[PDB]
Amino acid sequence: DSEERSSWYWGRLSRQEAVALLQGQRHGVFLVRDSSTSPGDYVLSVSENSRVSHYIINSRRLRIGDQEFDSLPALLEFYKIHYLDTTTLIEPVARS
Ligand SMILES: [Cl-]
Ligand SMILES: [Cl-]
């Protein structure tokens, strides 16, 4: 009913732009961007291991590795609770 402030979703953001935003952020700081190469898919970018990880989300059916979810919020919630490689999702990257 009411529009929300922009948060974790950045639409069609390049990998380079995602890195610019996330490099140096505390581990678990993240965003989601549209796939640059595969219409319909997404990428979860997250500060991790002192660098930036980019997890491919393949598409009510969203798959990351061997884990499937029925929505992006569900996927993000799952990885707030469960580790990816070395981090969980903590919070969306802040906007200037
Ligand atoms: Cl950290
Ligand atoms: Cl931030």
From Swiss-Prot:
Keyword tags: Acetylation, Cell membrane, Cytoplasm, Membrane, Phosphoprotein, Proto-oncogene, Repeat, SH2 domain, SH3 domain
Residues of the full protein shown: 6 to 121 of 304
Organism: Mus musculus (Mouse)
Molecular-function annotations in GO: cytoskeletal protein binding; ephrin receptor binding; insulin-like growth factor receptor binding; phosphotyrosine residue binding; protein phosphorylated amino acid binding; protein tyrosine kinase binding; scaffold protein binding; SH2 domain binding
Entry comment, domain topic: The C-terminal SH3 domain function as a negative modulator for transformation and the N-terminal SH3 domain appears to function as a positive regulator for transformation. The SH2 domain mediates interaction with tyrosine phosphorylated proteins. Mediates interaction with SHB.
The encoding gene: Crk
Record GO biological process: actin cytoskeleton organization; cell chemotaxis; cell population proliferation; cellular response to endothelin; cellular response to insulin-like growth factor stimulus; cellular response to nerve growth factor stimulus; cellular response to nitric oxide; cellular response to transforming growth factor beta stimulus
Family indicated by similarity: Belongs to the CRK family.
A single cellular component GO annotation: cytoplasm
Its biological purpose: Involved in cell branching and adhesion mediated by BCAR1-CRK-RAPGEF1 signaling and activation of RAP1. Isoform CRK-II: Regulates cell adhesion, spreading and migration. Mediates attachment-induced MAPK8 activation, membrane ruffling and cell motility in a Rac-dependent manner. Involved in phagocytosis of apoptotic cells and cell motility via its interaction with DOCK1 and DOCK4. May regulate the EFNA5-EPHA3 signaling.
Assembly: Component of a complex comprised of SH2D3C, BCAR1/CAS, and CRK. Within the complex, interacts with SH2D3C (via C-terminus), and BCAR1/CAS. Found in a complex with ABL1, ABL2, CRK and UNC119; leading to the inhibition of CRK phosphorylation by ABL kinases. Interacts with ABL1, C3G, DOCK3, DOCK5, MAP4K1, MAPK8 and SOS via its first SH3 domain. Interacts (via SH2 domain) with BCAR1, CBL, CBLB, PXN, IRS4 and GAB1 upon stimulus-induced tyrosine phosphorylation. Interacts (via SH2 domain) with several tyrosine-phosphorylated growth factor receptors such as EGFR and INSR.
Coiled-coil region: none
Protein name: Adapter molecule crk
Modified-residue entries (Phosphoserine), positions: S35, S36
Phosphotyrosine modification, residue list: Y83
Tissue distribution of the protein: Ubiquitous.
Modification after translation (UniProt): This leads finally to the down-regulation of the Crk signaling pathway. Isoform Crk-II: Phosphorylated by KIT.
Compartment(s) where it occurs, according to its Swiss-Prot or TrEMBL record: Cytoplasm; Cell membrane
Keyword Phosphoprotein: yes
SH2 domain residues: 8-93
